[PDB]
């Protein structure tokens, strides 16, 4: 038959012609199972490769190359063919400690197409070091040469498949995926490898689930139906829209059927090499509404003169229905190209080149020396040639970097069923040359598969769970921003007393608002205080121009002159209120204004007392009146009140501090008013409390004798001025209790100026009136009346 061709050096093969998709005493042969077409395709590829070696006189001249292909089941039959290959021509395999002198029947073996059988065959062959170039086996366990010394490969491992998947996800900006594996070892290792790889590229896995192993052509149980319903419900409820599947193609019919039944659409499925080229699933022709079906598969290399050769055409070494099965799938195989066929082609060519180099042939003659399998392995480890514009050389880890290819399923039989969209180069670990992909969206937009929306400019990122890439966006509170260069996970406030608005990434400096010389209310208050100051200066000039008069002598001469000078000083330091509040400014203000005002009010009160209530008190305590008249009662009272005010103002300075303060007004954080007392309400309340305690007794004493002429109607004018001061203080207290803002300083200054104006006018202006316009009442002879 075609499974055997005698030659100088045989070349064993292992191709899965049949698979199981529906008692140990009866051994089920591979013939009873359903016929697979890929196995016969690869077998014909190997036959064509050997036949081309035979044609080529430049490669292996005068050395006929043969082969012995044995049908190997998927799992069931994997030991007998190895024993056949290693047995001698008599089917006897000797046992010895060392096998260097041993000459096997075959010189090399093309390994099985599934990883488990490859592992078993390589485990058996490790004793004799028979070169075994497996194809289409993608397990990472074959990458190490400690336990597989004589195992080579012509297909990139699952490492490069996973890398291509991750690069495809990165290119389209997907960071929230779903992994579905199978109960078999292949799915589990692929899922674990993808999970290990994807964690370092800022891509998270929403959830991983295992699809129960379920061959087709058999009815499903209730437990597996419930399991599939649960899987599909979990898939639909999650927000991820990129589903990678690591499962053999046989177990995916029921899952996709359940997905169609559940009416779930909008998933960008990513396929491993197992079912990315499976023709039956594409022929199902109802998945076109699910979404785009990407997949990872080996790049197709067009072999010249292979389609015509393929179309031209012991135990477990026969098949009958292979040709009939391949007849139906001929067109799709021709259109889709050859992907795994080139792997077998290259493996056979590598064996041929290793034999040619080992024999040392000079393209004319060959030495025809006996070749041991270990010598062939040592030679094939160091082959480096070309084949269809592809370099064939083996890495130290037993792999040749064949270009991968991301393929997208296209539901149109007029062209290739699996249209290539991208190419991956394992040598540089780079995925490049990406073409347009027909997406399933409304207007061909790349589907979005991100768990968390991008945060708005100036929004703190708060982790929501275990997954790093998922977060929630919460606005930073007023007064802070985000320094994206430093960290975006926590707001960083702006120092230097500057405030920020909501969702604002640039702190702005607060403007320092304060009393300034060129404004309207300050100019009005300055004009009022100037009018008062010139009025009081004129009063003082008049008083010094008119002395030795009953008006100024019955009244306290030194007392009134001192009060006038203190009012002059207070008016002259009034503009110290305006301007930049410094330590000296507040020191002078609080050591001058309250002192002067308090001593003026104390003088007024003691004068009212001595003019009204002294006469009445003269009746009860006579010796007290003698003490009062012998000394200078009003002067000692004024001194005592002055020292008490000194004590209280010193305690106020020691309590509330001296440094000018910055208070953030509720109207506009952007502004910051500066007063000099950090605690101003309590200080003003204390000052007004002492002043009003003195004022109530002063005004009561003035009222008690308001009709007595005394010192030219002193009680009446004291009463008028003191009631004016009381009303002004009440107005200030109420306005303070019902307002707090920028106008506090100007209102306080206005009230102080008005109080000084009251004390000046309503107590001295009558005196100026009588002195100037009434020159008859100031004569000494009028003292009698």
């Amino acid at each position: 038959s075609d499974f055997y061709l005698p030659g100088d050096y045989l070349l064993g093969g292992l191709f899965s012609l049949h698979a199981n998709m529906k008692n140990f005493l009866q051994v089920p042969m591979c013939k009873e199972y359903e016929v697979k077409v890929i196995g016969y395709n690869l077998m014909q590829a190997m036959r064509f490769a050997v036949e081309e070696i035979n044609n080529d006189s430049s490669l292996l001249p005068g050395v006929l190359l043969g082969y012995e292909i044995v049908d190997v089941c998927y799992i069931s039959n994997n030991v007998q063919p190895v024993l056949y290959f290693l047995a001698h021509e008599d089917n006897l395999l000797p046992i010895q400690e060392d096998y260097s002198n041993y000459i096997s029947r075959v010189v090399a073996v093309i390994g099985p197409d599934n990883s488990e059988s490859v592992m078993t065959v390589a485990n058996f062959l490790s004793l004799f070091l028979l070169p075994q170039i497996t194809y289409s086996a993608i397990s990472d366990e074959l990458r190490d040469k400690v336990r597989f010394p004589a195992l080579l490969r012509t297909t990139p491992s699952a490492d490069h498949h996973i890398e291509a998947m991750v690069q495809l996800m990165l290119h389209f900006r997907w960071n929230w995926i779903i992994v579905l594996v199978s109960s078999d070892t292949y799915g589990r290792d692929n899922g674990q490898l993808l999970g290990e790889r994807v964690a370092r590229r800022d891509i998270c896995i929403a959830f991983q689930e295992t699809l129960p192993t379920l061959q087709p052509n058999q009815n499903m149980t209730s437990e597996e139906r419930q399991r599939l319903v649960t899987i599909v419900d979990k898939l639909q409820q999650s927000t991820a829209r990129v589903v990678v599947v690591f499962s053999p193609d046989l177990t995916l019919y029921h899952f996709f059927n359940e997905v169609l039944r559940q009416n779930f659409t909008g998933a960008v499925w990513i396929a491993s090499e197992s079912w990315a080229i499976d023709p039956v699933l594409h022929n199902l022709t109802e998945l076109r509404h699910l979404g785009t079906f990407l997949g990872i598969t080996i790049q197709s290399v067009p072999i010249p003169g292979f389609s015509e050769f393929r179309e031209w055409g012991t135990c477990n070494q026969e098949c009958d229905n292979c040709l009939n099965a391949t007849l139906s799938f001929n067109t799709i195989l021709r259109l889709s190209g050859e992907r795994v066929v080139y792997s077998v082609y290259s493996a056979v060519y590598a064996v041929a080149h290793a034999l040619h180099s080992l024999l040392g042939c000079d393209k004319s003659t060959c030495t025809k020396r006996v070749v041991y399998p270990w010598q062939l392995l040592e030679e094939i480890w160091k082959v480096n040639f070309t084949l269809l514009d592809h370099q064939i050389f083996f890495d130290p880890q037993g792999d040749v970097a064949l270009h991968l290819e991301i393929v997208q399923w296209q539901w149109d039989r007029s062209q290739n069923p699996f249209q290539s969209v991208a190419s991956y180069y394992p040598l540089q670990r780079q995925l490049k040359n990406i073409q347009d992909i027909s997406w399933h969206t409304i207007n061909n937009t790349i589907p979005m598969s991100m768990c968390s929306k991008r945060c708005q400019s100036g929004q703190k990122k708060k982790p929501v769970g275990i997954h790093v890439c998922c977060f929630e966006c919460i606005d930073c509170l007023p007064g802070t921003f985000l320094n994206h260069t430093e960290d975006e996970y926590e707001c960083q406030a702006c120092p230097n007393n500057e405030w920020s608005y909501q969702s604002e990434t640039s702190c702005f400096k607060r403007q320092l608002v304060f009393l300034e010389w060129h404004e309207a209310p300050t100019i009005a208050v300055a004009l009022l205080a100037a009018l008062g100051f010139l009025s009081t200066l004129a009063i003082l000039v008049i008083f010094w121009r008119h002395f030795q008069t009953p008006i100024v002598r019955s009244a306290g001469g030194p007392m009134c002159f001192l009060m006038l000078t203190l009012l002059l000083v207070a008016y002259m330091v009034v503009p110290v209120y305006v301007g930049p509040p410094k330590v000296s400014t507040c020191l002078c203000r609080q050591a001058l204004f309250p002192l002067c005002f308090t001593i003026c009010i104390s003088c007024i009160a003691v004068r009212s007392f001595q003019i009204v209530c002294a006469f009445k008190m003269a009746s009860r305590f006579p010796r007290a009146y003698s003490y009062w008249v012998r000394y200078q009662g009003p002067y000692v009272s004024m001194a005592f009140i002055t020292v008490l005010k000194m004590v209280i103002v010193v305690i106020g300075m020691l309590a509330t501090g001296l440094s000018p303060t910055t208070r953030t007004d509720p109207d506009d954080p952007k502004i910051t008013i500066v007063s000099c007392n950090p605690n101003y309400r309590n200080s003003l309340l204390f000052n007004t409390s002492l002043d009003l305690l003195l004022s109530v007794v002063g005004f009561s004493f003035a009222y008690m004798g308001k009709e007595l002429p005394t010192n030219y109607n002193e009680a009446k004018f004291i009463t008028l001025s003191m009631t004016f001061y009381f009303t002004s203080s009440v107005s200030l207290c109420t306005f303070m209790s019902a307002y707090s803002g920028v106008l506090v300083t100007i209102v306080d200054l206005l009230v102080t100026v008005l109080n000084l104006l009251a004390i000046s006018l309503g107590y001295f202006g009558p005196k100026c009136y009588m002195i100037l316009f009434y020159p008859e009442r100031n004569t000494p002879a009028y003292f009698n009346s």
Partner: protein, 780 residues
Amino acid sequence: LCLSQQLRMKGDYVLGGLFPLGEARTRPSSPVCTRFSSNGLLWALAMKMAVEEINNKSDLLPGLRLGYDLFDTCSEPVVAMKPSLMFLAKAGSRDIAAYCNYTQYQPRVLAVIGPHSSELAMVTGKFFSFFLMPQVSYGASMELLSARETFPSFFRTVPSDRVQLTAAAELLQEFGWNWVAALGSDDEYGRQGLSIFSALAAARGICIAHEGLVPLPKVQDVLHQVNQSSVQVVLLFASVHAAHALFNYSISSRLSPKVWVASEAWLTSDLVMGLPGMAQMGTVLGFLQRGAQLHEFPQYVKTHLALATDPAFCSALQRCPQCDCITLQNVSAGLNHHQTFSVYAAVYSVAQALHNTLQCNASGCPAQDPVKPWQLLENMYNLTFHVGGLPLRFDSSGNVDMEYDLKLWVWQGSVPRLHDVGRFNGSLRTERLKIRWHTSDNQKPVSRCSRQCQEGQVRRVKGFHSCCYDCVDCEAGSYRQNPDDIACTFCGQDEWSPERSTRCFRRRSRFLAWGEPAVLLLLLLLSLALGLVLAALGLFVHHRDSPLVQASGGPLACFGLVCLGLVCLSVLLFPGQPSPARCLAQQPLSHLPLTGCLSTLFLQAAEIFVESELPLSWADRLSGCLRGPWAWLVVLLAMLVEVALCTWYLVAFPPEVVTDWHMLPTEALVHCRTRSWVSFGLAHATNATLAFLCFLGTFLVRSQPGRYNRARGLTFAMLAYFITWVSFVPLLANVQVVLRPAVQMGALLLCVLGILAAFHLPRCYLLMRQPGLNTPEFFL
């Protein structure tokens, strides 16, 4: 010593053997292991003792000799494949044929006692299955070796990982921990255990928060992932070295204590058990095997070593060249190893299967053709073999069944000991009363996830397999828009939402309604004030020619009473729904009449002050002009300036009816608000100056005892106005925003009542009750 010479023994049926006797390419040469291992020699001697005991017995294998070929296989499979090929070779020949199927073979060994290593057992079983050679392997544990599809002739004497993992899952479910983290070693043992436990947890409802692989001697990321989830029960299905590295790193980083469910690999290993500082790593709960022990094995080992020391027997009579040059002290540490019983029972199982296959009684065994190895398999399943008084059975999948003990570590003087606190014979039965946990008190460490979310909550999937949900409550003002939402959505900022609500409720208005108790009381006060104004007006218009009203104004007094009544009337328009016109016209309507009455009172005060504290020369001209048409022009000017100020502040300062949607908790607001202290202050300034002038000109005066004090009433009216409004302002700035209009009307009504009871009421008292003081010489 020549101990290795005893590794063979001729007999009618000879058993194979693959033991780890020794320990650790270009040419195809089998590697040679020269290092010596005590465990392998102990197991080989156990098998030899079992074979000798079977030969000794007369009721088992009667008149038949059972042999053994104990071959040394290292942990590597390359060195182990050669003994297997020797086993499958024809007896007396060194060549193994490559036949079509198993039936044509004539193997030299009846059965094989499989390798201890399960990774080696994989290759050995897959090789033997083609020839259907019955191999029973001690120590091979992981589950996929039980698959009859690829291992039709692989049995074992130790339980699979499936039963112990089922026991662990049942323990976690029974103790309530359905939110656990699963870890495993990077070798095949850990991966298979992780897959099996994943299946069992999915079946039992348990949730795996993080499934990860601790690398063999990275770990930091695994610990970080475990700590990220709030998990207090961690199943570590790892080998000894991986567990030791894990616990050493956890000691270095001071990881918080957790309940470590231990696999049998490191549950009883002294390396992990004796780690310094390990006591602070929570409780360790494992499932140790419950198997009998050979009570005479050490005696046999000592006696056989001594008998081998004698040269007479040794001369009277390689696989382990290093096994000859040993002493007793080189093996004394491993006599009490529980795999010796497994080897013993495996040999007994093969012997009993052979006895059943030959079908013979205790007296003898009939002669027949030699039995092929593949004929044992028909009787090795369904096989009941008694080993040391305890019966064992081979399941349909070659699995033996035995009980388990839940052992937990305790700590006293850094001495960890194992106590049985449970038993697993297919159904877990724990005694948790005696269990001492690691927490502050003796309480079970809780580790539970919410399988379902309570109604009205948002659900966030959590776990490596989306097993449970995290219920999160969000603060008021938010609602769950749809059940599948991952975050509750806000509603329209004009509607309120209660805490933990499926939907929001609309915000309805709440202003000062006509039915509120405060408005009712203020309405009664307004009624009383208006009645007083009407009575005073009636008295002032009936006794209009009397000296009382003539001195106290005249037409002007009645005009002021009308104005006070109109102020009381304008009080009415504050409450109710804030129409823009009403809220705009609140204040001007309040001050327009009050301005008129205050100006009339000020005219009276000015007349009194002019007649009192001025020279007669100016008085004779001021008094005759301040009463009459000039007084009317003065009151008209006051009203006109009030009108001008009111219209200017109405066109410039906007009184707005704003709807503060975010003031009341469950309701909106309709606040009629104007400029802060600017609008009403400016409208109030004219009245303030008018009242202050009246008070200043009236409050001090000479009241002769023979006349009438016409200043007391005006002084007290101004005082009532001032004190009531000075008290009103803080109430304006302090009372709740709803009752602000009520405060305003209360202030206006109190001002009117004070003015009345101070000025008009004392006049009316003597105008109505005691008309004996109405003489012109007393008033004018």
